[PDB]
Amino acid sequence: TPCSFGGVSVITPGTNTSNQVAVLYQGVNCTWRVYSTGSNVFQTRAGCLIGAEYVNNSYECDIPIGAGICASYQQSIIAYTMSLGAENSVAYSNNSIAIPTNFTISVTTEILPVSMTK
């Protein structure tokens, strides 16, 4: 079975913000053959991520990773799992109605291309 190749990707925040980065290897297993170490080593299904820590919290996604993993910037880079949204439970009954009383109006914008340069 031949030796597996990689595919290296770079996680970075804004250059105006900072310069600390993280390095991800696609499909490569660390659990292993990654030359050396850094701040931390993680073992996602997408690959092996170094230069960031994993937390048990849940936030929204700004920079996607894969397999429901997303990284963000706090003084350090933190990777975490997907948070699909705020948890809600609406009460159901045989005789319960929620009737609105007040209302708002709003405006939204939609950008549509039409034609490009001949």
């Binding site: 009737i99 609105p100 009383t101 405006v107 939204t108 914008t109 039409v114």
Partner: protein, 163 residues
């Protein structure tokens, strides 16, 4: 021209034959990619024309098509190689919970609202609509009668004023 100036015409076609083929493949790839982009550009333009016809010139009833929530209006504005839409929509803000019943029993007769929801604050019963809270007194003209007071489930005894 340096190939022509340096070499001798029998080996010219030996040298400059693959330049023509390579530039031809580059042109072919560019034309194919332009056609690929133009197809989806035309599809987006057709969608924009549909939104021009439906959202602007009328009040479309399709959900989520002409904005978010119930759609009231739209405005067009031009843009460099494009268009932008300002959708004016309407949403509810505040809600309150109430108790209901599918029909009203009166004189052994079921009563069904002609247009609205039967609600109660605890003591009296009223009929409203489905997007605002305007209670009204139950009267003959806002309801209609079809059947008796045993077949349905969830009815409640009440009174109906006759004008």
């Amino acid at each position: 021209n340096d190939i022509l100036s340096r070499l001798d015409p029998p080996e010219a076609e030996v040298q400059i034959d693959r330049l023509i083929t390579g530039r031809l493949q580059s042109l072919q790839t560019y034309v194919t990619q332009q056609l690929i982009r133009a197809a989806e550009i035309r599809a987006s333009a057709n969608l924009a024309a549909t939104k021009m016809s439906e959202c602007v010139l009328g009040q479309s009833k399709r959900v989520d098509f002409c904005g978010k929530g119930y759609h009231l209006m739209s405005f067009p504005q031009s843009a460099p190689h494009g268009v932008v839409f300002l959708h004016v929509t309407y949403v509810p803000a505040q809600e309150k919970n109430f108790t209901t019943a599918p029909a009203i029993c009166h004189d052994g007769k079921a009563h069904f609202p002609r247009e609205g929801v039967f609600v109660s604050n605890g003591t009296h019963w009223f009929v409203t609509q489905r997007n605002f809270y305007e209670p009204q007194i139950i009267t003959t003209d806002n309801t209609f009668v079809s059947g008796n007071c045993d077949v349905v489930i969830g009815i409640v005894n009440n009174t109906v004023y006759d004008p």
